[PDB]
Design a protein around this nucleic acid. Structure first.
Lengths: 195, 139, 109, 191, 348
RNA sequence: CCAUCUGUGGGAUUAUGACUGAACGCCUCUAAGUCAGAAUCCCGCCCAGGCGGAACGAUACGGCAGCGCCGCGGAGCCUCGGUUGGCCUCGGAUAGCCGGUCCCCGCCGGGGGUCCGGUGCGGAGUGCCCUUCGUCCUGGGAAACGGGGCGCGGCCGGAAAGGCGGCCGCCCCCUCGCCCGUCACGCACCGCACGUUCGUGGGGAACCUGGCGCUAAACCAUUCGUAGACGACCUGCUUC
RNA sequence: CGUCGCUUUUUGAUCCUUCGAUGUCGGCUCUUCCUAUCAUUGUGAAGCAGAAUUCGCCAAGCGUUGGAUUGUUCACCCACU
RNA sequence: AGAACUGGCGCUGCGGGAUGAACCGAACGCCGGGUUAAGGCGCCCGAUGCCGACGCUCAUCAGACCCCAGAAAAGGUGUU
């Protein structure tokens, strides 16, 4: 049906190289909390090539022309717009299946997000080289919604920690409830055969 | 942090390549990313291997520096590595992970009809714990 | 009752970079991701089930709105293990991304 | 060159005890406590030995440029062990020309208001880093004594008075004003 | 190339889309953003301009060649009848800005309130809110109405107030109430909404929001001047008399190779009737309009303590193209955007 | 400007100046790490609001229909795509995880010893539904919550795009709601494809069919002139 | 004394395109951009005491006029700045 | 601008060089299967989704594939 990618710790283009291929095959990929996306190189360089990106502007009127989106959901969304053949109808309908969400919505906060170990800052960069957030280069340029985005995360991470406490509260039983010696036989058939 | 190392005389699991699954003993290192390993009682002979091919264990050994197969064959069987490798909780995993591969199709029907039994035995008994802790605090 | 076909999307045509060759599709079945392990799927008979306006069906059942384009796996393709296949028609190019149906016929093992 | 291991060891005196979260160095001394997490440097900290308290910092595969910075851990530990027991006293003397540099301190040693600097009619309120304190220097004229625990909260704040007193649009080879750091000592002497 | 004698741009590109504004009422773009310490008070307010007079006051400003001499200043007076607070509108804030959470309107609503909900009051059956005033009387719909305040207190954060003007107390012909929607910058959201449910459909005078000699902002729509050309719109210089086909125009509207007219060049369109915000207008006097019993009638407006006369701020002959002020007013200093008889909002 | 009125602040930083501090036993503004910093750049304020989204109001009987919701069958017409779902920690990477007495949080959990496991088995290379062909005779293990649902009724739960999630108590009903054995039966359509599921899908129009309901606005014409090239806009028309 | 480049705002060399026509000097009017910055902001250096100056750095946000003779571009001059 | 030896465009498409007269491959009846050439193999875009090998490299103006599309002297206790 639908896959729900988490966005923290991932690089920008290394994720959207994967996302743009899994969307031209017919799946629906939803990138969730794209606020915390790492990007390569030190912060001041990535800011310059996004500040110097802002002057890309047709001279006779800019209302027509280069639509600089500023929110870090539509930063990542413009990157997949580059790596799709979006002029054909084969590429217009590859943006009908991508919905990158800034922060985490209520449709998807009670879903289980996935991560891709081909685009992670953990796996891919050498640990002695600097990185930059899509969080605070998008806020530094225009996107005026940084405070009310992190404010809603602690209301999500409040109703998550009480859920993670209560799932392991439910899980603590089924190791101790499994303690009864009554059901002995149905484990001959699985310790032998990959319990 | 870093509770085990590489060392002259360390048993090392080998992850991939032409020697997957077999154990080797790190005997001597050469340059920054390769070794000179061997296994006498596990059918993999003295040669050089990279370090990203192998996979460290908790089995130190007591060798000289880069001795022959005559004195590795002693400390391999004197330590009884294969028994100590088998009855640990990491060759009970890789063997069961390949016990599921050679699990045949009639065997899966023996699994599925017996898995769906015990997971119902636990549920009508974990409910008996979901009721004897609410009844603690009805008032 | 129960699905008796391995899942498979339709991935493109057998192309160079400019021109494409229409005569053989190439697939991406769900599950193989290496050429070394696609040897099961060589020769399996694959079908493109889709919908249209009238009826025309084959068995004892009355015709309803389904029709199909049969076909078979030709050979392997690439290191990542996708599979090209030669149907007895050409694919309508609308089916890009939507699944086809790789059966269990041609079963040697 | 890619050297196998580079290391320095750190003694800890018995009056103080470092415990660590990992790369966070929780130092609890007599006069205060302080801490510096080091998540930028990727080196392991291993305290070792009872009754002796040796701290050992060791970086296994650093490039000349990361073999460089294993000393920067242990040199930044010995400015907490020396800083939590002694604590840093900085003494700056105002070199004043014909116009005397006046100064008062309002909010418990944290707001320094610097008037009559070089005849200017402007007051410079230079609030300090949180944790440090000032002094009207007793038994010494026009001196200003800064105390605290962490040296990079002291000296950064202590530089904000030498830097804020700047003679602009003039000569700086002549016209020598400002309250320059002249003595970098500790609170407890000879200890 | 390289103009040889520099000039600045005629007109400013920050006001650039010179449009007939899509509104007649001055929309407040941004209210003052509050601290929760200060008391429970409003921001913006409605008033209609009527005309202008001037003034003579005794300035006090030591340091100029002006101090303690009589100084005339051009003033403008703006008539404010008391409002009636009707709706309570609560806003939740998102990662996409604000969002209107839900609203509550007052129990019974007045006659010019219902006149905004139609484009024809004559033909229509006047049937707005007839099935919404029946959720206050019933206790079936009452507890799901106060359900919409305790939820309003729990989630949404920047609540506002719907009010409008009283149009029986003006000399206009208009009689539609200009419904507004203004923000309460009170304390916490407990005290912010606790102050409004008590005071739905009770009035708000102008001397309850504004203090005299505090300098405020005006939002209004400019004087509509028509379809005017370049030398009257961007004030580009007239060409000399010998010019063929036309004098009152810009001559060269761009270079060759950008083969495309820039937006930056000055050309003709619709001058006037734009939306503007005048910044920093001091209020000179708050007036009280036609007082009650004792004496046949009392005018007593514009009766300063250095004048001592039976006068009122309606000029002799009444205001030109407005009428005659009977009510409270606000006299600003200077020029204020709009025709006479035009709605222009004040704002803290 | 030939008279008058008004024009406003924040953030990351450039250059530069420093701090601590190695590289290099000393020195160092830099290599890791920190600080000040401006007509710059970004944003506020101001102007326009999008093949973008909210909130609320009103919803067409008269002499006749009609039009909504909830429970309704029955057929026609069009669009096509899918063959089971995971209902959620935070984050760490020179480490993190589980189980745990004690002190600190309005009788439960934030803080430390202590005990496990770690190429992750309290393992989305996994997990649970599950491949349940139907049904009967007929035995054993498992089973005191019965489970479909027009239910009936209460409750509180989830605002970032809530379009959902439980509990408790009663109700036409069942004690065959699982696993293993005993007994055979059902289209066994005679080798053969478009099988099985989402799904009593989604869209629009009629006829016999049950209840609860509702009985209005737009634009023209007229008028206004706060507006006007025309359009548009601003307004008015009560039997006082 | 040398020596190494850059820019196409000078002139020249070349003839690629246009000869069934690209309307060719200047000025007026007007918008935008360049930085190799005259003034302004933030700094550094001086054979910088102050004041007046000069050379460098980030920098195109802002300004860079009125006049006599000339068809003038350029010039030169008066005068504010 | 002008010559010498050979080849090519001119008369010529096709795969490649992002596009291109001449460059590198290769020269054409109409097509089914197979394999390669110069080229390439993160996504546009067929193919590295190989558990590729060994190094070098931090750029507040990175670099990135013949002809071919913007550079030198001199200098650096950057670093090997």
């Amino acid at each position: 049906q639908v896959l729900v990618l988490d966005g923290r710790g991932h690089l920008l283009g290394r994720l959207a190289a994967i996302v743009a291929k899994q969307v031209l095959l017919g799946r629906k990929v939803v990138v969730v909390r794209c606020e915390g996306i790492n990007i390569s190189g030190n912060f001041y360089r990535n800011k310059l090539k996004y500040l110097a990106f802002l002057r890309k502007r047709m001279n006779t009127n800019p209302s027509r022309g280069p639509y600089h989106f500023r929110a870090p959901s539509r930063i990542f969304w413009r990157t997949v717009r580059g790596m799709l053949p979006h002029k054909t109808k084969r590429g217009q309908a590859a943006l009908d299946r991508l919905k990158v969400f800034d922060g985490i919505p209520p449709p998807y906060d009670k879903k289980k997000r996935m991560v891709v170990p081909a685009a992670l800052k953990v796996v891919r960069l050498k640990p002695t080289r600097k990185f930059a957030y899509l969080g605070r280069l998008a806020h530094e340029v225009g996107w005026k919604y940084q405070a009310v985005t992190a404010t809603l995360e602690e209301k999500r991470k409040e109703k998550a920690k009480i859920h993670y406490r209560k799932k392991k509260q439910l899980m603590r039983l089924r190791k101790q409830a499994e303690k009864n010696v009554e059901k002995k036989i149905d484990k001959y058939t699985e310790v032998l055969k990959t319990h | 942090v870093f509770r085990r190392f590489v060392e002259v005389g360390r048993v090392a699991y080998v992850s991939f390549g032409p020697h997957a699954g077999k154990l080797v003993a790190i005997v001597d290192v050469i340059d920054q990313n390769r070794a000179l390993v061997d296994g006498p009682c596990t059918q993999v002979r003295r040669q050089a291997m990279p370090f990203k091919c192998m996979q460290l264990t908790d089995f130190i050994l007591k060798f000289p520096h880069s001795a022959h197969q005559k004195y590795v064959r002693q400390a391999w069987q004197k330590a009884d590595i294969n028994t100590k490798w088998a009855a640990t909780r990491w060759a009970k995993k890789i063997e069961a992970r390949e016990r599921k591969a050679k699990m045949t199709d009639f065997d899966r029907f023996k699994v599925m009809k017996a898995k769906k039994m015990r997971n119902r035995i636990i549920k009508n008994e974990v409910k008996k714990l979901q009721k004897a802790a609410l009844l603690k605090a009805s008032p | 009752s129960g699905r008796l076909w391995s899942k498979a999307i339709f991935a493109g045509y057998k192309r160079g970079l400019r021109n494409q060759r229409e005569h053989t599709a190439l697939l991406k079945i769900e599950g193989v991701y290496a050429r070394d392990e696609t040897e099961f799927y060589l020769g399996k008979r694959c079908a493109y089930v889709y919908k249209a306006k009238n009826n025309t069906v084959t068995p004892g059942g009355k015709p309803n709105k389904t029709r199909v384009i049969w076909g078979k796996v030709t050979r392997a393709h690439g290191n990542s293990g996708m599979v090209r296949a030669k149907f007895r028609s050409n694919l309508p190019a609308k089916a890009i991304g939507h699944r086809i149906r790789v059966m269990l016929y041609p079963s040697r093992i | 060159m890619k050297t196998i291991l580079s290391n320095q060891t750190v003694d800890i005196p018995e009056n103080v005890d470092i415990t660590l979260k990992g790369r966070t160095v929780i130092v609890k001394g007599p006069r205060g406590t302080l801490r510096r997490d080091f998540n930028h440097i990727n080196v392991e900290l291993s305290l070792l030995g009872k009754k002796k308290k040796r701290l050992r910092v060791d970086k296994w595969w650093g490039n000349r440029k990361e073999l460089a910075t294993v000393r920067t851990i242990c040199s930044h530990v010995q400015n907490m062990i020396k800083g939590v027991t002694l604590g840093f006293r900085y003494k700056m003397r105002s070199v004043y020309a014909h116009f005397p540099i006046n100064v008062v301190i309002q909010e418990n040693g944290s707001l320094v208001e610097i008037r009559n600097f070089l005849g200017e009619k402007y007051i410079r309120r230079v609030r300090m880093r949180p944790g440090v304190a000032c002094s009207v220097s007793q038994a010494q004229k026009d001196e200003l004594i800064l105390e605290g625990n962490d040296i990079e909260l002291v000296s950064n704040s202590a530089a904000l008075i030498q830097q804020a007193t700047t003679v602009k649009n003039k000569d700086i080879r002549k016209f020598l004003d400002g309250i320059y750091v002249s003595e970098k000592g500790t609170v407890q002497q000879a200890d | 190339s390289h103009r040889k004698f520099s000039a600045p741009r005629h007109g400013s590109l920050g006001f650039l889309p010179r449009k007939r504004s899509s509104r007649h009422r001055g929309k407040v773009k941004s209210f003052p953003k509050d601290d929760p310490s200060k008391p429970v008070h409003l921001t913006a307010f409605l008033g209609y301009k009527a005309g202008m007079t001037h003034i003579v006051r005794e300035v006090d400003r030591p340091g100029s060649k002006v101090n303690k001499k009589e100084v005339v200043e051009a003033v403008t007076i703006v008539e404010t009848p008391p409002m009636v607070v009707v709706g309570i509108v609560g806003y939740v804030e998102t990662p996409r800005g604000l969002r209107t959470f839900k609203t509550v309107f007052a129990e019974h609503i007045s006659d010019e309130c219902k006149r905004r909900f139609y484009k024809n009051w004559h033909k229509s059956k006047k049937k707005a809110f007839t099935k919404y005033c029946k959720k206050w009387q019933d206790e079936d719909g009452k507890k799901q109405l106060e359900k919409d305040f305790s939820s309003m207190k729990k989630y949404c954060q920047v609540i506002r107030v719907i009010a409008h003007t009283q149009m029986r107390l003006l000399p206009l012909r208009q009689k539609k109430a200009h419904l507004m929607e203004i923000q309460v910058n009170g304390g916490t959201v407990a005290e912010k909404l606790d102050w409004a449910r008590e005071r739905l459909e009770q009035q708000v005078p102008v001397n309850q929001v504004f203090g005299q000699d505090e300098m405020i902002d005006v939002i209004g729509v400019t004087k509509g001047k028509g379809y005017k050309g370049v030398t009257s719109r961007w004030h580009t210089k007239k060409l000399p008399r010998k010019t063929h086909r036309g004098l009152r125009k810009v001559a060269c509207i761009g270079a060759w190779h950008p083969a495309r007219v820039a937006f930056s060049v000055a050309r003709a369109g619709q001058k006037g009737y734009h939306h503007r915000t005048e910044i920093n207008k001091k209020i000179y006097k708050i007036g009280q309009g036609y007082l009650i019993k004792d004496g046949k009638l009392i005018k007593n407006n514009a009766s300063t303590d250095y004048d001592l006369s039976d006068k009122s701020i309606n000029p002799l002959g009444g205001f030109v193209h407005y009428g005659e002020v009977t009510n409270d007013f606000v006299m600003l200093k200077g020029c204020v955007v709009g025709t006479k008889k035009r709605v222009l909002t004040l704002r803290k």
